[PDB]
Ligand binder design. Structure first.
Ligand SMILES: [Cl-]
Ligand SMILES: [Mg+2]
Ligand SMILES: [Mg+2]
Ligand SMILES: [Mg+2]
Lengths: 138, 448, 448, 138, 138, 448
C-alpha cells in the first residue's frame, strides 16, 4: 500500500522540478531544511535518521536538491523526506514534511490484538519489513 | 442620573491590567448615548439605587465599571459603541463563569437601553496569564499526528444517528482509510436507546486502529464524551483514554465549568479536545442582542479547548469573509491588532497561550478548495458531510477525492501559483490522475 | 427540496412520547413558510445533502424530525409558528446537554430561514420522568424553614463587592435579624483578590446563627459556590454543607452539566439550591432570535434547581404580566394548559416533578406590595436591593418595613379585602403601627 | 424578644375578629385546621403539642375559635398556633401557620459555640426557658 | 476578670479626654467611626450590636463623644467599644477597636471539655452571664 | 566574548512582563565590568560554548538574558551593579523552585567574575499574579484574632528544649494568660527522644483554650509542623487543624517546594502559617556573595507564608534601620518605589497579593518600645525571649509588663505625643500603674 505520511502523499511522487519549487517555498518562509530517512515506517517513529544537518539560511535550491539526490543514491530503498523547520516564536516546529523517495514495494503493517479487560483490546501495528534486520528491508 | 454617579468618565485612563468591553448599545428612544453607556457600566458593576453607607467601608471607586468612550455606530444613527473598563481585581483568576457573570449579567438599564450586544473584549495580559489555554494546541497537535503544512480533513458520520456500533464503526473505518484525518461523532450522539456509548467507543477504536494499519498514519475519531453530569463525562473521557483515542469531543452546551474541567483533564491526559459549537443555531444572525462570536473564541481559547468551529466563508455558511478572518486571528495569532473591518476593536496580547484550531464545516465541497485555502489558511480542519459518505463510488472514494484536492491546492499555493484565479484548472489537473476526484468534480457542477 | 424529503408532514399524528418544539420562524425573503418549517426540522434531525446509502442500514424515518404544523404569527405577516416533533428515542435520558444540543443546535437552513426563536417545548411525560426535578422543591423547602402561606423575603448584600469577610457578615446579620428570610451573595462574588471565599463562608455562618438566635427563625444566606471547575465548586459546596448552611447558590453561566451535577449534590445533601439567572442581560429583549425564557424554566425545573429569578411585573423590570404569569405556572404547576396569551403553546403534564420557587428581583419596593402579591402569588421570593440596606434608619429597619408590608398584605388578601384596589390604604394602616414602614412609605412617594 | 415564627408575627397579636377571618380563609381553602402549643420555642422544634385533633370539613369558624380560647385558658403561658393543612395533590402539607398566644415575656435564646476543626464552629441555640422544666417556664 | 479584647484593655479605662484624642487620631486617619455594644463577650462574637450607623467624614470629636455617652447611659451594663474602619484599598477593614464601657463586674467564662477520639478534646467557652437572658446580665 | 554574543545590550528596552534582577558583581581582577555583566547574563540564560545549530530551531533571542545596564557601586571602585532582564516565558508560573533555579543557578563566569550577590528582583505584575500570596495575610489574620491597631506580642518557650508535654504546656498557658497574643515552638523543636510531637500538640491546645477562657481573647501557639518528609508534615498540620489551632509554623530549611505546599494547605484550611527564618545564621553578614534578604521576602510573600522574621533595628540585632525598613515595605506595601538607601532598586506592583506580617525578634526588651514602634510600625509581631519567662515575678508578670508597655506606647503615638523623644517618660507613666512593668523597667537599666 502507499504510506500517506507526508504533506503530498495523495499526489504522485514529486518530480525534481516540483521538489525545487517546494524548496523555494521553504526558502521564502525562512525555514531550516532537513533531509531524513528511515526504513521503519511506523507512524509513531518520530526520529528518522538525519542525512546531514539541516541547512540554514539557504538561498538557492541547488545544494538541497544535490543532497536529496545523494541520499537517494545511498538509501534508494528507504523512505526519504524533506522537512522544513520554523523558528518563529510560538511555532518553533516543523511546518512542512514531504516524501521524496519510497521503496519499490510497500508490504504495510501487521495489526496485533492483545485481549485485555472485558472487551477491550490493546493494539500494536508492526511494519512487516521491521520483522527483518535493516539491511534486509525493501 | 448614571453619568452623575461616576459611571461615565470621558477622561478615564485605561490601565494595562483593566478588562475592557465593547458593547453595541441601542438607547431607548430619546435617551442620551452617554446616559446609556453609563447605565450598562453602572449596572455590570453595582446594583444600588439609594443612600448606601456600606460602600464607604470599601474602596468603592475600585469596584465601579467606567464607561469611558462612546462612538456612534457607522451606518447606524441610533446605535452606539460603548467601551467599558473593569478593574482586574473584580475577577476570579482562571474562571470563565466569573468573567461572563460579571460582564454580560448585570448590564441592565431597561429605561435608558433598548438593545445591547457585546461585540469584543480586551482581556488584559495578566488576566489571560491566569488561564491554561488550549490543552494541546495547534503545534503539539500537529507533532502528535505528524501532519504538517496542510489543513486537516474530517467529516461527521452519516447518518448522524441509528447505526449500530458495528455499522457505525464501518463508516469510520471506510472514511479514515480513504483519506480523512478524522471522523467524528455528531454533537447529538451521546448515549441513547438506539446505541449506548461504550459499544460505540469499542467499535470505533477497532476502526481507527485498522485505518492506521491500512495507511501508516495517525488516525483519530472524535468520541463525544458530552453527558448530563461531570461524573458521567469523566467515565466517558476515561474509556477514550483507556482505549488509546488520540481525540475526544464535547458540546458547548455542557457549559463553561464542565468545559474548563474537561480542558484541564485533556491537558493532564494528553488528549486533543474538540469543542462543538453549532455554526447556525437560533442564537445566530443577531446584529442586535447577545454576544458576538469572537468573544466566545476568546473565552474558549482561554478555557483551553483545541478545536472550535469558526465558520467558513463560502458554501452554505454565508458570512462576511473579513469578520470570519477576524475569528481565525483570535484563535490563532499570538497578538491581535485592532481592525474595524474584522470587528476587532482592541489590540490584545495572547500572553503565549497556545493556539486553537479553527474548524470549517458547512455545505463545503472539493470544487471550492481554492477558496477554502485562500480564505481559511493551512491551520484549519475542513469538515465535509455528504461530500464524502455519498460519493457514488463509496466512502473511501469520497475521502480520497477531498484529500487529493486538498493536497493539490496546497502544492499550487506553495508553488506561488495564482491559485485563487487558477483554482478550477488546478483541480482539473489533479483529477486527471484521480478518478474519484474526477467523479466528485462532475458530481458538483450542477451547483455551478 | 425540504418538504420533499419527508421533513414536512401536515398529516403527522403527534404521539404522547414525542418531544415537540414550537419555533417562531422568519422565512428568508421569498421562501415558503412550509419550506422554512421543513428546513428547521430537516436540519435539527439530519445533516445530509446527497445519495447516502448508510441511512438504509437504520430505521431512517424514526430519526427524522417532523415539521407538522405551520400557523402565521398573529400581527406579523412574515413570521410563522412552526411545530416540530422529535421521536423520544433520539434523546439521552436525564440529559439537558443532549436535549439542547439536539433541538437548538442543528436547526440550520440559512437559505430558507432568516430568523429563528424557540418559543416553547412539549416535553413528554416519559421523558420528564427521567429527570430528577428540584432538589428540594417548594413544599420541602417550606417545611425545612417552617414558613408557610407568604412569600419569602431576601436581598443581595450591598455593596455587591468590597466588604471584608467581617464587614460582609455585619450586613448579613443586620438584614436577617431585621426580618429578611434570606440574604444572598451577588452572582459576581465567588473568590477574588479583595475577598476569598472561605472567610466569607465562615463569617456568614456566624451572622446566620446569630440571626436565628435573635429571632427564633430558621435563617439562610445563599453562599455562592460558582467556580471555574467542578472540583472547585464541590469544595465550596462541601464547606457550606459542613458549616450547616440551609442554602447555596450557583450562577446559570456555569452551564447545564455543572447545574445537573450540583442539583444531584443538593438532593443528596439536603441543600436548597438557588439558581441565579440575570433578569436583564445582553440576551434579553429579543422578539426575534434565541429562546424564550419559558423554555429555560422548563429545562431548569427538570435539571432540578430550587429557585430561579422569573421576573417581576412592576418596578424597573417592565414585562407583560400575562407572559410572566406563564413563567410562574411553568415553575409551579403540576400541569400546564395551552394558553396563547401566556405564551404556553402546549398542554404539559409535569409528571409529579417538584416545584421551583420563582424569585422576583428588580427595582421593586414596599409600596408596591399589593401589586406584587396580586401578580406573583404567595410562592415567590421577593428580593429588595437598596430598599433594605439604604433605609435611612439602618438595614434592620429596612428589612422590618418590607416584612411588615408583606405580612399586612397577605393578611388583607386572606381577609378577602380588595387588596389590589385598597393596597395603599392597607400599607398606610400597617405603617401606623410601624415607624420603619412609615419611613419607607414616605421615602418612596417622590417616585409616585 | 418577639419570636417571629408564624405567618403574621411581624404584625401585632391578632384580635379574635382577625383570627375569625383567617379561619374563614382556611375554610374557603378547604384545609384541615389544627391547634398546637409549646413552650420549647426552638425553630427546629417541628412537633408542637396537639390541642385535640385537627378539625376537618369545617363550615363555621365558631367551634375553631372556641377551642382556640379553651387552649388559651389551659396553656396561657405557652405559644399557641393555628395550622392549616392542605390535602391537594402535590402540596399535602401546611400552607399557613400563625401564632394566636405568646407568653407574657420572651427571654430568647442562648448561642453555644463549640470550636471545631481550624476556624469552624459547631452552633447550638437553646431557648432559655428550656433550661427549666416545662411546668416552670414562662 | 478583665476582658482584654480591645487595643488598650491592658491600660486603665480611658478618660473622656483620652477617648477624645483617640477620635482625633481616627479623624486624621480618615476612618469611619462606629460604636458597638454587647453583653455576650465571647471572643468569637464578631457582631456586637450597632449603636447607630458608623459616622463618616467626621471633623470634630464632639458628636462622637456625645453618642458614646448616650450609649453609656442606655447600655451602662454592657461592653461598649469604638471601632475605626479604613476604606483604603487593600485594608478595607477595622484598624482600631477599643473598649469605652465595661460592666461593674466580669465573672468570665466556663470551659467545656467534650472528650473525643483518643485523647483529643473538643473545647467550648461560654460566658457565664450568657447562661441568662440578656436583660438579666451584669 | 560575552558582550559579543548579544548578552550585553546597552540599548535593550525593559518590558512590563520582564523579570529583572540586580546583581552586585565583582569582576575578576582586570576584566571589564561590561564583560562581567554579560557573563552573569550569558550563563543564567544558556550554557553553550561552540557552533550549536540546534539554537536555530528555536526563537533563540527570546531565551537569552540581557545585561542591559551597569552602574558602579557607590563607595566601591571594583564592585558594579548589573541589571539583567529575563523574558517571562522562561519561567514556570507559580513556581519558586523554577524562579530560583533560573536566576541564582547558572550565573557562572568564573573567569570574568570574582564575586556575585543578588540584591533585588523586579517580578513583573503578570508573573506575581500567578502566585497565591499569603495564605491568610495581615488583614484576615487580624479579623480572625479580633486584634487591631497594635503590634502583636509573642515569645518562644523557655527553655527551647527539654520540658515534658505537661511542663511545656504550663509555660504556654502562663505566658498567654499574662498577656502575650502568641507563644511559639522553637524552630528546633519538631519531634525528638525527649518529647514527641503529638503530646506537645495536645497539651498545648489545653493551655491555649485555658488562656482564651482566662482572658476572653483569641490566643494561639505556633505548633511547629516541620518534618523530614511531606507526608509527615501533613500529619502534623492535620492534628493542628483537628484540635482547632489558629496557627502553625514551619522552618525555612524545609525548602521552597514544601513551603508552597504548606501555603496552599494553610489557605485551604484557614490556618495562619508562620515561617521561621534564622535572623543571624552562618549565611548573614555577607556584603559580597549570595542573596540579599529582601529577595527572600519577595519570594516568600509570593509563596504565601503569613509571618516572616524581618529584623529589628535595635537590641542585639544591629542593622541599618533604613535597609530594615525596606524589608518591611516589601512584606507590607501594595507597591514598592525604587529607593536606593532602602536597597530597593526597582519599582514593583504587588498585584494585590496579601501582606505578610514582619516578626521582630532579638535581644529586644520593654524599655525599647518607643524605638520599636517608631522603627517597625503597628503591623509587626514583637517577640521577647527571657524578657518574659525570666521576669523575677513569673511568666505572667513578664508578659503583662510587655503588653502594658506596648499598649501605652501606641496610646501615646495615637495622641500625637512625640513618643520617640518622650519614650522613657511615657513608659515610666505607664509603670506607675503597673508593678510588673515597674519591675521590668528597673531590671533593664543596668543595660543603660
Ligand atoms: Cl461533636
Ligand atoms: Mg463541528
Ligand atoms: Mg437573582
Ligand atoms: Mg522567629
Amino acid at each position: 500500500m502507499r504510506i500517506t505520511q507526508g504533506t503530498f502523499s495523495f499526489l504522485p511522487d514529486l518530480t525534481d522540478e516540483q521538489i525545487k519549487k517546494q524548496i523555494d517555498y521553504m526558502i521564502s518562509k525562512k525555514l531550516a531544511i532537513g533531509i531524513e530517512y528511515t526504513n521503519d515506517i511506523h507512524p509513531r517513529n518520530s526520529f528518522w535518521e538525519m542525512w546531514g544537518l539541516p541547512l540554514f539560511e539557504v538561498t538557492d535550491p541547488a545544494p538541497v536538491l544535490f543532497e536529496i539526490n545523494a541520499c537517494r543514491k545511498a538509501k534508494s530503498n528507504f523512505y526519504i523526506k524533506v522537512v522544513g523547520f520554523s523558528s518563529e516564536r510560538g511555532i518553533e516546529s516543523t511546518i512542512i514534511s514531504f516524501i521524496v523517495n519510497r521503496p519499490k514495494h510497500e508490504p504495510g503493517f501487521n495489526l496485533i490484538r492483545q485481549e485485555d479487560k472485558s472487551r477491550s483490546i490493546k493494539y500494536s501495528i508492526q511494519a512487516y519489513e521491521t520483522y527483518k534486520p535493516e539491511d534486509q528491508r525493501y | 442620573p448614571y453619568a452623575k454617579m461616576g459611571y461615565w468618565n470621558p477622561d478615564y485612563q485605561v490601565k494595562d491590567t483593566d478588562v475592557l468591553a465593547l458593547f453595541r448599545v441601542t438607547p431607548q428612544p430619546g435617551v442620551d448615548p452617554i446616559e446609556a453607556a453609563a447605565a450598562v457600566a453602572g449596572e455590570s458593576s453595582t446594583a444600588t439605587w439609594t443612600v448606601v453607607w456600606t460602600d464607604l467601608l470599601t474602596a468603592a471607586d475600585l469596584y465601579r465599571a467606567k464607561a469611558y468612550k462612546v462612538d456612534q455606530v457607522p451606518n447606524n444613527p441610533e446605535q452606539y459603541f460603548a467601551y467599558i473598563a473593569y478593574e482586574l481585581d473584580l475577577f476570579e483568576e482562571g474562571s470563565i463563569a466569573n468573567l461572563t457573570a460579571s460582564i454580560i449579567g448585570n448590564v441592565f438599564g431597561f429605561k435608558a437601553v433598548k438593545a445591547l450586544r457585546l461585540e469584543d473584549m480586551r482581556l488584559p495580559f495578566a488576566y489571560i496569564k491566569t488561564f491554561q489555554g488550549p490543552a494541546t494546541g495547534v503545534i503539539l497537535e500537529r507533532e502528535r499526528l505528524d501532519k504538517f503544512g496542510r489543513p486537516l480533513l474530517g467529516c461527521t458520520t452519516k447518518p448522524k444517528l441509528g447505526l449500530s456500533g458495528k455499522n457505525y464503526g464501518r463508516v469510520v473505518y471506510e472514511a479514515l482509510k480513504g483519506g480523512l484525518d478524522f471522523v467524528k461523532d455528531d454533537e447529538n450522539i451521546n448515549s441513547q436507546p438506539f446505541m449506548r456509548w461504550r459499544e460505540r467507543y469499542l467499535f470505533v477504536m477497532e476502526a481507527v486502529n485498522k485505518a492506521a494499519a491500512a495507511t501508516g498514519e495517525v488516525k483519530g475519531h472524535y468520541l463525544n464524551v458530552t453527558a448530563a453530569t461531570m461524573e458521567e463525562m469523566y467515565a466517558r473521557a476515561q474509556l477514550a483514554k483507556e482505549l488509546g483515542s488520540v481525540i475526544i469531543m464535547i458540546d458547548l452546551v455542557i457549559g463553561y465549568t464542565a468545559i474548563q474541567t474537561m480542558a484541564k483533564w485533556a491537558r493532564d491526559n494528553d488528549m486533543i479536545l474538540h469543542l462543538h459549537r453549532a455554526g447556525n443555531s437560533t442564537y445566530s444572525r443577531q446584529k442586535n442582542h447577545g454576544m458576538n462570536f469572537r468573544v466566545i473564541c476568546k473565552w474558549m481559547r482561554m478555557a483551553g479547548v483545541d478545536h472550535i468551529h469558526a465558520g467558513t466563508v463560502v458554501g452554505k455558511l454565508e458570512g462576511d469573509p473579513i469578520i470570519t478572518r477576524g475569528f481565525y486571528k483570535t484563535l490563532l495569532l499570538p497578538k491581535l491588532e485592532r481592525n474595524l473591518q474584522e470587528g476587532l476593536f482592541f489590540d490584545m496580547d495572547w500572553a503565549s497561550l497556545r493556539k486553537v484550531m479553527p474548524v470549517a464545516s458547512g455545505g463545503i465541497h472539493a470544487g471550492q478548495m481554492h477558496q477554502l485555502i485562500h480564505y481559511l489558511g493551512e491551520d484549519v480542519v475542513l469538515q465535509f458531510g455528504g461530500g464524502t459518505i455519498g460519493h457514488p463510488d463509496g466512502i473511501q472514494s469520497g475521502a480520497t477525492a477531498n484529500r487529493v484536492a486538498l493536497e493539490a491546492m496546497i502544492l499550487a499555493r506553495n508553488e506561488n501559483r495564482d491559485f485563487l484565479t487558477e483554482g478550477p484548472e488546478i483541480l482539473r489537473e489533479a483529477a486527471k490522475n484521480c478518478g474519484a476526484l474526477r467523479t466528485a468534480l462532475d458530481l458538483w457542477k450542477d451547483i455551478t
